[PDB]
Design a protein around this ligand. Structure first.
Ligand SMILES: O=P(O)(O)OC[C@H]1O[C@@](CO)(OP(=O)(O)O)[C@@H](O)[C@@H]1O
Ligand SMILES: O=P(O)(O)OC[C@H]1O[C@@](CO)(OP(=O)(O)O)[C@@H](O)[C@@H]1O
Ligand SMILES: [K+]
Ligand SMILES: [K+]
Ligand SMILES: [K+]
Ligand SMILES: [K+]
Ligand SMILES: [Mg+2]
Ligand SMILES: [Mg+2]
Ligand SMILES: [Mg+2]
Ligand SMILES: [Mg+2]
Lengths: 498, 498, 498, 498
C-alpha cells in the first residue's frame, strides 16, 4: 500500500545517483547567451523551450544557434522545442487606452467589429464572432487572464450581450478573453503560427509545443501544417481548457505527447480542478506510453528568490510522483535572477521524488491495463523491464532508430537508466522528453551498417561503463532484434559487463 | 490501483457537499477583530492559532476574547491553539531597521547584549549566548527563514564570531536564525514558554502547538509545565528539525498529534527532503489515528495576491491526498490582504482533493496495519466505517465525551461526515483538528444523564437533518455503548432517519 | 496467496475444536433403528435424508418417528429431509425379460407405446414422447445409468431412431435412460411425487431435496405443490443435468438451497466436467448466501471397508475447501457396514479442511462481489463477521426467527461458531444445513415475549458457556435489533461473557 | 479471487488441446507385454514405474526391454522409474494362504524365521527382527495397508509379542506392516536396495523413487549407492511417514523431486491429515521448481470397474489444481482389468482441471516468493513465461541439455506447451515428470555442434508445426543463450512461425 510504503520512507538514506525525470527550460534574456546555456545544461536542462508568444524570428534564431553551440561544446544532445503563440480571443481597444470597472457595472460586449477601436465603460468589442452562441445568460466571460469576471445577464441582439461586472479592474487595449466551459471554434493554426512552424521546420526543431489544442482534428491540422519536411517532428499538445480535458483520449492518440499547461488551464477551469485534470492526464499518458510534461509556476518564487517556497517543492515532487516524464520552467529561467539555482533545485527535488517512488508499483499498474494480446515488441519491452527488476539490473540498453523502442521501455518505468543507442541525432534530441532515457549516437556513415548489432551494443556498454551507470560484472538488460527480424526488437538478453 | 483510479477522474462531476478536512488560521493584525474572525469562521476556519513568538499576553487575550465572542455570535465551536515560541534564535535590532549585505561582506556576530539595539553591516547581535560553542569555524549560520547564509571564519572570542556573508540580503528587525547540524542546547520549555503555557491553562486554550519538539522527553516536559489543571489540553508536537524527524515514532507516541512544521524544517534539513518527511510523518500519524497538520507557505503568494499559484493549489491538494487532517495558514491570514479569500480557496481545494480520493483505499491500508486482536471499541469503530461504505451512509453518528471514539472512527477515514455528540464543550473544540468530525454539544447537567442514549442520538439525528447531511429515510450509522457498558462504545446500529 | 498459505500449513498443530461443516445422512436398513440413529447423531449427523426413490410411506414413517425419538433422547434438533424420486425416463420391457447387446449392433428405439412390453435386440421402447426431437443423428442416448451407450444414426419416422450400440451390455426390463445435453420436457413433479410431498407436509418435514430440477419454473411448481401448509419448508434443488447447470443462476434465485447431485450429474455430463460444475455451483451459492450440499460417493468404499480410500479423503476435504456447507452420505449410511465410522471420518476430515482454510479469504472474496449499497441487515451481518475477526471472537450470537439472519451471518464465513437463538423449533432443524450455526430454542409461550432481547441473549450466552464455545471474559459478537426496529437486525454489539 | 474465478467457470467451453500434466503408470501382469505398453503409451503414460517391492531382476529386465521396444515403435521418449522396496516390513506366509481373524482374537507375532512359511490364526511371522524393541505393550501394529489393528498385550520374549486383534480381516500372503509412532531403525539402503540400485544404474533407469525417505541424509545415502556412473539419475523422494513430512524442507533441498506417497503416509499419520500434507508438500515443491508426483488410490475402484467414482475424479482434478506435475497409478495399471481406460480417464480429468485453472495465479504466486536478485537464467525464464501470457503464445521453445532450463520455465507454470530441444536422450526421458514439457532430441554428434542454435530452433519450430501446437504466423517464445554465453540461457526471443 502507498501508506505502508510511506511509513518506511527514510530522509537519511542516500538518494538515487541517476536522475530519471527531465527538465524543460524556457530561454529568455536571463539565459540566451552561449555561456548561460552551458550552465543551464550543466545544471540539468534537457530541452530548451522557445516561447513564440514573444520575440521575433531573429530572436529565436539566436536561441537556436546558441543552444547548438553550447551543446556542441559539452557534447550533449539537447532538444529544441517551439512553443506556438496559438489562436486567441481579445477585446478591442478602448478610448484613451483604458477604462476602469467596478462591481455592479453593466457593460455591453459586442461582436460588431465597428466597435473594435472605441471601447468604453458602456460597450466594448470582443473579436470572437460566435460569442453570443457560445456563452448563455448566467455564463461567465473572463477578461485579462481571469482577473476580471463578467456574468452574462442577457442577449440584446445576435451580436451583443449585456453583462454584469463582478470585480474591480482596469482594462487596457486588447486584453485576453477566456470563455470558461464553452466550445471555441478557432482554427488549430493561426496565420502567425504557420510562419512560426515553417520557421521551425526550416531550422530543424525537434518538437512543437502546440497551444490550445481542443480536438484530435486540430492535432492533425498541426501535423498537416508541418508538411512532408516536418513529418518527424514531435507534436506535444498543450491541454489548456475544458475541451482539451474532455477530448484527452483522442488528443493523446493523435499527439506524440502532452503538456498539462496549468497556467491557461487554471484560467479556463476552476483553479482547484487543475489538480484533478493533472492527475488524470498524466496517468492517461502513462497508460499509453506517451511523454507528458507538467508546466507552469512550479518554482515561481525562484524568479526572485534564491530558495523555493515549501508549496513549490511539493509541487515538483508531486508531479514526479503523479508520473510526469518532464517538469518545466518558464519565467524562472526565461527572466528570473537565479536560472541556474532553480534548475538545480528542480533536479534535486526530482531525484528525491524518484527515490521515494515505490519501484514496481507503476510497472505493475501500467502493465495491468494493457490490452492482451500485446504486440510482440511491447511484450519484449515490458518483460525486459520485469527482468531488470528481477536481477536488480543497473542499466538497460536498447537499440532504437526512431525512438519508439526506447519510449516503449520507458513506458514501463524501470528504476534504472535506459541507454538508447540510436542512428539519428534527432532521436537523441527527442528522447530528452522521455523518463530515464540516456542517448548515445552511433554513426553508421562512419562505422558501417551493423546488421548484427554488435557495434551498437559495444558502444552502449562502453557508454554504460564510462558514465558510471554500471561496472564490470554487473548485469545489463539488452533489447534489440535478432539477426533476421526487421523494424522492431523481438529479443531481450541479460549480459554481464565484461 | 492509483493509476486506474486516476484515469477515471473527471473535472465535470459535482464535488462533495461536506468538507472533511479542517483549516487552522493564524491570527494577527489582518484578522484579530471580532468582525474579521467572524468572516474567517464563515470562510472556513476551524482553529485559531495564537503565535506566541510575538505579542504580549494582553495581545493574545484580545485574540482569545474576540474568538469566543465571534464563535458565540455564530453558534460555532472554534478551537484555540497556543503555539509556543520555544527554543527560537533571533537577531537583535539594527540602526534604521535594515542593514544590507553584499557577498564576501565580512561581519562580526556577537552574543553580547550591549549590541542588541544597535546592529550594523559590521557587527550585530544574536540572542543565543552559547553561539560560539554551537558553531565552529567552517560551520554555517542561516538567517531569516534560510534566505541568507554566513560561513564562520573564526571565533574572535567567547562572545564574537567573524563571519563571511555568502549572498545578497536586506535584513529587517529580529529575524530568525537556524543552526542546522549544530548541538544547540536550549530547553523545550524556557522560562518564557512556562509563563505562556500557564497563561494558556488559565485562559482555557484547547491545544498547544509545541515548537521544535526533539524527543518524547520534551513532549513530557510540555505536559508537566501544563500541570494538573492542564492535563486535558492536546499537545500537538511540531516537527521542525532533523532530530524531530529521527525520533518521530516515540514523539508520536507521546503526543496527541503532530504538525509538519515545514517552515523551520525546510531550513533545518535540505528543502527537497521535506516532501519525503511530510509523506512519512502524515502516514505514521494516520496509522495510529492521531491528528496531523500540514503547515506553512501553502498559499503563500496569496499573502499579497487575490489568486494562488498553480504550485500552491497542488500543495494543498496533495497534503489532503497524503492523509493530513488539517491544513494551516500563517502569514496568509495573520498579515495578508486577502485573509477571507485565502481561506475560501483552501476550503475549495480541500473539497476537490477529498472528492478525488478513492473511497476505501485509506480504510483498508489503515486496517491492514493494525495489530490483531484489536480492542473491542476499535473493532466496533472500524466495522462501523465499513458498514457505512456498504450502505452508502450519508452520515455517521457517534457519542463521545473525551473525543476518543470520534478520533477512532475518523482514523478509518469514512467518506461521509462523522457527527459527534459530546458532553464537553472542550471536546467540541478539540475535535476541530480531526478529519470529518462535526460536533454537537449535549449539556448533561441541563438535560439529564441520558443513560439509554436516546436524547443524544435524537440531538444528532436532528442535526443531521438540519445541516442537510441526510434526510428522512436515509441510513445513518450510529455508534455508542449499549445499556450497560461504560467507558467506550461496544455497539453499532444502522438507523433510518425518521 | 493460496500457495503461500499452503507452504505454511502444519499437520502437527491442534485442529479446530468446533466443527463448522454439516453432515447429511441417508437412512436405511443399516441406520433406521432408534439405537442406530442415536449413534449416527453422536457421530455427527445433522440432517437425516429419506430417499423416496425406495420404500413405502410406512417405511419412511418409521424413519420420521425414530429420528424424532432419537433426537428427543439426546436433546438435539435434527433436520428431516425428503428426497423425491423425481420424474424419469425408462425403456420398455423386453421379451424373456432381458436382451444382450454387442458393439456394432443396430437397434431401433421407438416412442410408439405399442412396443412397450415387446422389446427385442432389434427394437425397443423408450417412454419419452419427444425423443426424436430431443436427440439428433450423432447424438447419444445413455441406457442404465450410462453403462450402455447408443449413437443415433438416423431418424426413421417421427417416433423411431436407428441407433448404433457402443459397448457390451445386458438390458433387463425398464432401465433408466439419460439424454446427455438434451432439454427434457418432463414435469417438475410426477404423480408419485405429489403424494410424496403431501406426505412430507403432513409429517412436518423440514426440507425437500427436489430431484432433476432444470428450471426456476420447476422450483416454483415444487413450491406450489407444497401449497399453503408447506410454505415454510426449504426447497433444496438437486442439480442433475446440463440444463440444471446452465440455469443455475435462476434456479439458485428460486430455491432455498442447492445439491450438487454428482451421481446423476456424472451420468448426464462427462464425469470429468463434474468438478468444474461443482466448483462453479458451490461458489455461486456462497456468493448469494444459500446453503449448498455436495453429494454422492464421497466415502463410497466405506460402504464395505472400515477406512476410506485416499481419493475419498481428499474428495471430502476439497468439497469443504470449495466452500460447501454440507457433505452427504448415501449408501455409506443407508446400507453400509460401518455407518458410524463413516460419519466419524467425515466429521474428522471436515475439521481438518476447516483448520487448513485461510480465515478471512472467503470473507473478503464474498464481500467483494456484493452489490453496493447493501440492505442494512446485510451490512450489519458482514460487519459483525468482520468485527469477529478483528477481536478474535470465539463465538457470535444472533437472534433469528425465520433463520434469515443466521444464514446471512454464515454467508460471510466466520471462523467461529454462530449461536442462533430462535423462537421456532423448525428453524433449529433447518439451520442444520448452514455452516457454523448452532441453534438454541427460546420458548416464548413459556418465558414470555422478550421485546428487549435480554432473555434470548442471556440464553445464548449461557449456551455459549455450557457448550464450551467461550468462557468468562471472552468477547462474543451479538447481532439482533435495537429496541424499536422490527423484522431484521440493525444492531451489532461486542460483549464480554460475564 | 478464487471465488470470482469459480463463478465464471463453464462446462460448455472447449477444453485445452494439449495436456500439461503427466501420468506415471506402474507396470505389472496387466501391462508388461510390448503390446500392453504400447497401448498405455498411446493412452497417455509418460513414465513407467517398476515396483521393486516384488519381482526379480529378471522380471524387471523384461519390463525395461519391453518399455524400450514399445517406445521405439512409437517414436516416444518414455521415462523409466525404479521404485525401491526400502525399509519395508511384511508378514510371512500362512498355511493355505489366508487365515481369518475375529475381534478379541489373541495372537502371537514372532520375528523367528522358523515360522515364516507356516503362519496360523495363533502365531505368524513378521520380517522385522527388532520388532519387540520397536513396539512395547499398549503400542499398535497395523497390518495390510492399515486395514487391521493389533494392540500389544505383552512381550513374551525377545522374539515374540502377544497381541489382541482389534477387528475383522481376512489375511493374504506377505502383507504390509506399519508401526506408526515407533522407533523403527532400518536402513534407507538395505543390502537388497543396494543391488536394485546398481541394477538400475547398469540398466540405465532414468529416476529412482526412493521409498520411506526420512532425512536429507537418507537422500544422500541413495545418491552414494548410485555411485559415479549413476550421478545424473533423478532421485524422487517418497514422503511416506511422519518424519518425512517433518523434514520436508531439507528433503526437498537434497532431492530432484518428491512423491506424496499417500498409501503408506495415510497409515503412518491419521488419514484425514494426508490432505493437509499433500497441499503443503506440493506447494513447497512448486515454490523451488521441483517436480512433485501425487500418488496412490487416485482411480482405485477402476482396478475392477470400467468407471471411476465421483470421489476419484475429484481427487485427480484436485491434485492438478493443487499444483502437482504428475499423477500416478499403481494397482490400477499393474493389475487392473481396465489399464487403458483408467489412463484415459486420468488424462481427460487432467485436461479438465488444467482448463479450469486460472491462467496467471500460479505464475504470480510463485514469482512473488522468489528471493531477489534472481540469477540471470531465472529472470530470463520467468520473464519469458510472462511474455508468453502477454502475446497469448501457443508454445514456448527452450534449448536444454541437462533439463534445468526446461524445469525452470515449467516452474512458472505457463498455459501452453514448453517444447524442449535437448541433446540428451536421458533428458527427454527425465523431463516426463515436468508439467507442460514436450521433448525433441537433437543428436549433436550426428548433426553438428549448432553453436548459433539455428539447427535446434528449426527442429523445435517444425515440431511445433507438425504436432499442431502452432501454425504459420503464430508467435512462439524461444529461450536459449546468445552467441557467446555458455552454461545457461541469457536470451528470450519472440518469433513468428515461418
Ligand atoms: O527505431 P525503433 O522503431 O525503435 O526500432 C529499433 C529496433 O529495430 C531493429 C531491427 O530492425 O533495428 P536495427 O535494424 O537498426 O538493428 C532492432 O535492432 C531495434 O531494436
Ligand atoms: O427471523 P429473522 O428474519 O432472522 O429476523 C430476526 C431479527 O428481527 C428481530 C427484530 O424484529 O427479531 P425480534 O423481533 O424477535 O427481536 C431482531 O431482534 C432479530 O435479530
Ligand atoms: K506560447
Ligand atoms: K511559534
Ligand atoms: K431420490
Ligand atoms: K516400492
Ligand atoms: Mg493560451
Ligand atoms: Mg517553526
Ligand atoms: Mg435422477
Ligand atoms: Mg509406499
Amino acid at each position: 500500500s502507498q501508506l505502508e510504503h510511506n511509513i518506511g520512507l527514510s530522509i537519511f538514506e542516500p538518494v538515487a545517483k541517476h536522475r530519471a525525470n527531465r527538465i524543460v527550460c524556457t530561454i529568455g534574456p536571463s539565459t540566451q547567451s552561449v555561456e548561460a546555456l552551458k550552465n543551464l545544461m550543466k545544471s540539468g536542462m534537457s530541452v530548451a523551450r522557445m516561447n513564440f508568444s514573444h520575440g521575433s524570428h531573429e530572436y529565436h534564431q539566436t536561441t537556436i544557434n546558441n543552444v547548438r553551440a553550447a551543446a556542441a561544446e559539452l557534447g550533449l544532445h539537447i532538444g529544441i522545442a517551439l512553443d506556438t503563440k496559438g489562436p486567441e480571443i481579445r477585446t478591442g481597444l478602448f478610448k484613451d487606452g483604458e477604462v476602469s470597472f467596478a462591481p455592479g457595472d453593466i457593460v455591453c460586449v459586442t461582436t460588431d467589429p465597428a466597435y473594435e477601436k472605441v471601447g468604453t465603460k458602456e460597450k466594448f468589442y470582443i473579436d470572437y464572432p460566435q460569442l453570443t452562441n457560445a456563452v448563455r445568460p448566467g455564463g461567465s466571460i473572463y477578461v485579462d487572464d481571469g482577473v476580471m469576471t463578467l456574468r452574462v445577464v442577457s442577449k440584446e441582439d445576435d451580436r451583443t450581450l449585456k453583462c454584469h461586472v463582478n470585480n474591480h479592474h482596469r482594462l487596457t487595449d486588447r486584453r485576453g478573453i477566456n470563455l470558461p466551459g464553452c466550445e471555441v471554434d478557432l482554427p488549430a493554426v493561426s496565420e502567425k503560427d504557420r510562419k512560426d512552424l515553417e520557421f521551425g521546420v526550416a531550422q530543424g526543431v525537434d518538437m512543437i509545443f502546440a497551444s490550445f489544442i481542443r480536438t484530435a482534428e486540430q492535432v492533425r491540422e498541426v501535423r498537416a501544417a508541418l508538411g512532408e519536411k516536418g513529418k518527424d517532428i514531435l507534436i506535444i499538445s498543450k491541454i489548456e481548457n475544458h475541451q482539451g480535458v474532455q477530448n484527452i483520449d483522442s488528443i493523446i492518440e493523435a499527439s506524440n505527447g502532452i503538456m498539462v499547461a496549468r497556467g491557461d488551464l487554471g484560467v479556463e477551469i476552476p483553479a482547484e480542478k487543475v489538480c484533478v485534470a493533472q492527475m488524470c492526464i498524466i496517468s492517461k499518458c502513462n497508460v499509453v506510453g506517451k511523454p507528458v510534461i507538467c508546466a507552469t509556476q512550479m518554482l515561481e518564487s525562484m524568479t526572485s528568490n534564491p530558495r523555493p517556497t515549501r508549496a513549490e517543492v511539493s509541487d515538483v515532487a508531486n508531479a514526479v510522483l503523479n508520473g510526469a516524464d518532464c517538469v518545466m520552467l518558464s519565467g524562472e529561467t526565461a527572466k528570473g535572477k537565479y536560472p541556474n539555482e532553480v534548475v538545480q533545485y528542480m533536479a534535486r527535488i526530482c531525484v528525491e521524488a524518484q527515490s521515494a517512488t515505490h519501484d514496481t508499483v507503476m510497472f505493475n499498474s501500467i502493465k495491468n491495463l494493457q490490452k492482451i494480446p500485446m504486440c510482440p515488441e511491447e511484450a519484449v519491452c515490458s518483460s525486459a523491464v520485469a527482468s531488470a527488476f528481477e536481477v536488480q539490473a543497473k542499466a538497460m540498453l536498447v537499440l532504437s532508430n526512431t525512438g519508439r523502442s526506447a519510449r516503449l521501455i520507458s513506458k514501463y518505468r524501470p528504476n534504472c537508466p535506459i541507454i538508447c543507442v540510436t542512428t539519428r541525432l534527432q532521436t537523441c534530441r527527442q528522447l530528452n522528453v522521455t523518463r530515464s532515457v540516456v542517448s548515445v549516437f552511433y554513426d553508421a556513415a562512419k562505422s558501417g551498417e551493423d546488421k548484427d548489432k554488435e557495434k551498437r551494443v559495444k558502444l552502449g556498454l562502453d557508454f554504460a561503463k564510462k558514465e558510471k551507470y554500471a561496472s564490470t560484472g554487473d548485469v545489463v538488460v539488452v533489447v534489440h532484434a535478432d539477426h533476421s527480424v526487421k523494424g522492431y526488437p523481438n529479443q531481450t538478453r541479460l549480459i554481464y559487463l565484461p
